[PDB]
From a paper:
The ATP binding cassette ([name]) transporter of mitochondria (Atm) from [name] ([name]) has been implicated in the maturation of cytosolic iron-sulfur proteins and heavy metal detoxification, plausibly by exporting glutathione derivatives. Structures for Atm family members are currently available for ScAtm1, the bacterial homolog NaAtm1 from Novosphingobium aromaticivorans and human ABCB6; the pairwise sequence identities between these homologous transporters range from 40% to 46%. These proteins occur as homodimers of half-transporters, where each half-transporter contains a transmembrane domain (TMD) followed by the canonical nucleotide binding domain (NBD) that defines the [name] transporter family. The translocation of substrates across the membrane proceeds through an alternating access mechanism involving the ATP-dependent interconversion between inward- and outward-facing conformational states. Using single-particle cryo-electron microscopy, we have determined four structures of [name] in three different conformational states: two inward-facing conformations (with and without bound oxidized glutathione [GSSG]), together with closed and outward-facing states stabilized by MgADP-VO4.
Numbering used by the authors:
A (entry chain B), B (entry chain A): 117 to 716
Amino acid sequence: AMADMKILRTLAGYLWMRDNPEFRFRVIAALGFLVGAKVLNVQVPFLFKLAVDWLASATGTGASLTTFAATNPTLLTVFATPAAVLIGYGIARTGSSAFNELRTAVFSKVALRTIRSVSRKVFSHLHDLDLRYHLSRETGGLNRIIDRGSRAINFILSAMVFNVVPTILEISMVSGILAYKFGAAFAWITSLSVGSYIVFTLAVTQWRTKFRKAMNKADNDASTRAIDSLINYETVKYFNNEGYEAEKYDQFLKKYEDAALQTQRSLAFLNFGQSIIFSTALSTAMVLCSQGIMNGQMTVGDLVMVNGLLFQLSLPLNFLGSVYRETIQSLVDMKSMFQLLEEKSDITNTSDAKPLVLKGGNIEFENVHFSYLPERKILDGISFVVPAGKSVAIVGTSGSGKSTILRMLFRFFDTDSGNIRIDGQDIKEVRLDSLRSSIGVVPQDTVLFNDTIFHNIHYGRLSATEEEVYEAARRAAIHETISNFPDKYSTIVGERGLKLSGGEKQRVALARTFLKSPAILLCDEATSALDSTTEAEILNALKALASNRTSIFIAHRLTTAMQCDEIVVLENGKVVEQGPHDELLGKSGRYAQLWTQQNS
Amino acid sequence: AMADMKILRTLAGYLWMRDNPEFRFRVIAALGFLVGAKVLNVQVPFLFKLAVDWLASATGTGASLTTFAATNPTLLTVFATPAAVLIGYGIARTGSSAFNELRTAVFSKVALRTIRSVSRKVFSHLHDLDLRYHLSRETGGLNRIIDRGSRAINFILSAMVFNVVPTILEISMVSGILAYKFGAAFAWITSLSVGSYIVFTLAVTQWRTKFRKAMNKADNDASTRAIDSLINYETVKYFNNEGYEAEKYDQFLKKYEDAALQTQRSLAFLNFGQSIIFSTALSTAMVLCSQGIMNGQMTVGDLVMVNGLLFQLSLPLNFLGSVYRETIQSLVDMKSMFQLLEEKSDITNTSDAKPLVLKGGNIEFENVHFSYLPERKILDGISFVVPAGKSVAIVGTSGSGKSTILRMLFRFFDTDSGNIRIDGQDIKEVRLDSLRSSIGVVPQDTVLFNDTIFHNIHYGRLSATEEEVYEAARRAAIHETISNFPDKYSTIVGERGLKLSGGEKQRVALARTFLKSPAILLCDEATSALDSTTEAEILNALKALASNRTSIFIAHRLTTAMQCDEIVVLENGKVVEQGPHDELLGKSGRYAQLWTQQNS
């Protein structure tokens, strides 16, 4: 899995921010606080060797004339009386646990920042991605991917920095104390012991996982069975109630109670050998030291430190055994996330950027063909020309697939062989931002976020004052229905708020697009059915809004939009008729039947 | 909360099964394996005091003429050479960890059995409960209650037996070692220390919980916000994409990154004071022992055991601090479960039990009134008499609420002021089992469990042979459609199986009630709409089945069931018309309009 190492490389690439000097200093401090602690925690038993001696010298009849043999602690520190050394022992160990605990605090303000930068970058890249990717993927999946990946990053960094590195620095240093009070043969025994212990725990965890999975399977089966059985209460009650039902549930719970009694004996074998494997080490160490003591070796009274060193090693070893499943799962979730990234968008623009300079809006289509799939090609050469400042209507059946128009004009999908003339300019060259900003559109379904009305009504253009939004309201003719707001026009809307019917939601859409003050207006049959009183007035409002801007309206219903200058009949995904509606009715064409059946 | 102690009393009541001798023996063995371990784990440092001595006697110039002062270990055990004592140390501690681990295995085969008995009893009591309780309560809730309660029982028993009892036996015994090498003042210091440590950890955990809740709130808010934002991609894309959106998500993730950086410093204070509070104890103990050593007290070289005893106490203390939330939550979930139990069913029967001896079925209703709610009383004195072996039809509108009939005849709900004559007998006296067994009914919706066809087809009466189910199939006329089964008539059905249409499901219902061979047949308009070919034949089949048994059919549609002898019109929950259908059509009554609009 070479790509897995590559993913680690990417993680290192993102982790290190050269740009800012402070980050490096933070990391350095962290490392310092990781070393200091782990050397005080070895000073602790050396202080317990020093305090066992001198105590024995007095009353014990130990040779007092040994002066200061080692001469390493010749400093007057902790030599006032033996009680001082014991106090130093306590202070030392407490300070070690302080340094080590402090390191975590120093390194979490770094971990959080890393997670934040990766998540923000992924978010922005996601929105940059083209529509096709979003449509194919499931909405829930994106959530799962981001949350699990961020959690995985946090877990892996904490697991490594706080567990893998301290354990190995500890073991290496302890075995590296071979310079003093040690022999070459003696040092290897502890390393071999700990290596065997780690191998045994890691190997037996794999075995444990199978039993855990079997138990989860059985438990889920029993629960689902007893829920299916409870749900279908009526059938059971009518005839032979709980006659043969309880016995069957009993059998399921016997299978569960056996698959659960098995895992205990399996954990038992591990939790026993995890003791014996580490006890043989301590027995071997002590018996070997005793032989030296009784054989007149330099070792005198220093047996008491070995217990301490072994205890220090014994504490954090257990964590390493159980990290395998988490590591593999996190390391594949991280590949998932970093695979979501680095996916290029289909709709690339050319290098040179030219801004859309549109004096007046003219829509000219020239043999635009587009097939979503090879079998069915939606548009088969639609060509029409809209005069500036006029209204043109696109009508047809629902099979005609007139949804594409909006997607194409917004450059969601590109044309296989055609062009789009905007004020006699080619869209392929102009910047995406300039075009999407200069065009105005009203959505078909007006989804509102959960926030204050004033935010959902100034959303169209930010930096909107209260007077601007007021003038938009007045033209939107919403003041009659807005003075009843419970929170003086700040009432919360959306979920956990006042539910809005379609008419007000449409008014909100109008009072959101009126703010933007666009150059061209495009509609997508916002309302399918509505009360007559609201329809008429909203139609008048949108007619007034569209008076100074060239507009294009796509309406499945005919009577709804008859006010345009020309009407483009669309049937079987091609241009059928181009004229004012009256001779369309008089041509016995598609428009004629559709309208004559709309009124009937 | 006196009732909480009462709940503990109930738990003790259920835990102890006097009936079986083996259970007590198991529990006794468990307790033994809980004592032995916890006394070997105190033998361990005594063996490390014994091995520190004698080693010092040689080469150390220790007085060899002290003979055997204590005379407690005068046994020749572990006196071959000092190496033997070290080996004994290792073997002892390993054996302690074996005994203690073994206890868990011995006590889990008891815990599982307890959980099983409580769950099975609750299940049966649940099914015993009347319909009203089931209808009011939510189906999901019952699941949640059972699963959480069983988990709580397991957690509380394991938590107490494995943690609370060992910790207190350990502490009490250690402080109880006051007989040897101790003073009255010295013993109290350790108890005061550990008591202060437990108080500090418990108190500061409450504080930690508030920060954890704030963090969970903030995390959920950030996630829900970013999902709402991702979902509404279109609105964002049309205008000012990620212009002001990213900054707002950023602010949410700043709030999260602060509420998460706060909890670390809060945990930090706990994880530091949990060290200093326990370090002051060790420093005080050692300095006090050193004063004795230097003052010519009996204590000689036994300082090395105190470290071990303190370490043994230090290991399992941490668990007790975090158990508060789990204990309170489990202790209230247990009250939930034991509150579900001991709820009596409304439909009690009288003491004396008389069996239903029905020579022939005669249905006689006499002024039966029943109101589900005081406002609307469904039945207002329905009285009619069915002759034996005949077919009678109950017809009406959907507002007439004719659903009650089935519930009442099955004695789901009792009559406020009326009686039901079954073969000239009163239902109130006869046993519920006898009546519900002697009556036959076909369900309206035929829910099938996920199992083999042969099980879903012999379900009506257990102990059904292959020939019995074959004859039921032949009369059910299902052999034509059954020889196509992929698994030679053992094909799985239900979910994750072959989906069945309404016609086959109805055939299954017929081939389930035909098995039971009841004395009286009752229908509940099983089919609302179906293909003509199946309807006709299934009607013929049910006519043949009902020929020898008196039958009652409730049909909302009129043309569907015209074959009965008499027809009972029901309108506004009262008997309107009683006759053969032809003069019902000729009476211009409810039946006449209903049928004339069914055919139109």
